[PDB]
Structures are given as C-alpha cells and as structure tokens.
Symmetry: C3
Subunit: 84 residues, 3 copies
C-alpha cells in the first residue's frame, strides 16, 4: 500500500511495474515496487510541492519541483539528485 499520501499529484510506471507517485503535500516522491507491500521514499532532497514525475528506460526518475521552479532527477540506485 501507498500510505500517508497528501494530495498526490503525479504518477508514473516503469517497465518493471514499479509505480512512482509525487506525494505533493508531503514534499516527497514515493514508489512501490511491483509485488511489494511497502512503499519507499525516494532520496530527493529539498522538494517543494512537487507536481509531476516520469521514469526513463534506465530507471532514472524526473520530477517537476513545482515550488522551486526547477526539474530534478535521480539515476536508479543513486542517492544524489541532479538539478536539470
């Protein structure tokens, strides 16, 4: 289950069936792996009411950091976002 969401805004799904959600009112991005019962919080930092999310074929995750007027990305496995 996704839990503790606040007014979620965006959603994306990768080729593995992992679903990524911008949890807009909690200033975070969460994901739920296919056949997992437990969400994870992606290691973005400093998000402000994030609104949309996409995931490319390499599993890189892209987020419109709505409140900070910027776009950020995280490579799969990475813990350090890049600002586009």
């Amino acid at each position: 289950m996704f839990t503790g969401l606040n007014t979620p805004s965006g959603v994306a799904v990768d080729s593995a069936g992992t679903v990524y959600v911008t949890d807009h009112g909690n200033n975070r991005v969460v994901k739920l792996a296919a056949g997992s019962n437990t969400q994870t919080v992606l290691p973005f930092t400093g998000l402000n009411t994030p609104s949309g999310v996409a995931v490319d074929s390499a599993g890189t995750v892209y987020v419109t950091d709505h409140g900070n007027n910027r776009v950020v990305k995280l490579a799969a496995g990475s813990n350090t976002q890049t600002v586009l």
Copy 2:
C-alpha cells in the same frame, strides 16, 4: 474529440496511441482510442479532482486520486478499480 473537459490536469499515451486524460474538474478519467472519433469514460469510481495518469505496457491505468489522498488502478478490460 475530447469534449466536455473541465480543467484537465494529466495525460498519458499507450503504445497503441490511445490517449488517457484526467478530467480533473469532472472527477473522471477519459480516453480516446487511436483513430476513434469518440471518447470513453473509464470505469473508475469515487474520484475526487484526479490529477495525474499513467499507463503500463499491459494497458493498466494508474491515477492519482488527488482529493482522496490515494492512488487507484484499473487493468485493461476491468470494471473494478483497485486502491494501491
């Protein structure tokens, strides 16, 4: 044509070219099949100002049900959503 939309928020497109739209102010999700002149309303139920939509490779449709703080999905052909 898409018609009767109210402040649509999200859009997705599948490998068949079917376009899915969250019709935010009408509390519904609509789709337009590639080379169709007529939209369909997907059989989600109880949506509250839905904001984003995605579609996986099996045609499963995922929606951030923004006002209800939850994520919902419908398998292709299914009439019964699942809350994630």
Copy 3:
C-alpha cells in the same frame, strides 16, 4: 539547463532521453534534448496554464491545456498543433 521556469507542473521523457516539461506559469512547454545544454520552447500556441505532458513512441507530444479545457498535440518536427 532548464531556466526561466515558473511553477512547472508536468514532465515526460522519450526513448531518446529528451525531457519535456509543462512550464505552467509561463503558458508554454519546454524540452531539453539528451546531452544538450540548451532548452527549446515547443511551438504550441495559445496555451493557458498547461498542466500535464506525454510523448508517444513517434515523438508526438500531448499536453493538457488546463485553462482552455482541451488537449493539444504536436507531431515531431511539426510547427502546427492539433486540438484533440
């Protein structure tokens, strides 16, 4: 870099790694080609606080033109949008 964004809302990424963003408060859609240092503004016209974006396998770009209650698209290479 993406620059001059205002409260960006949606994001999509194509199979080439080109990232497309709805630059919501500037009434436009921007894109950044993979390994490019410079954004481009897509030739949509008349957008009103656009909210979501998607890109199909042929590079056609779809935008929910939120304020105008409509969905618009541009074929790759085209300078003339179509209203869906």
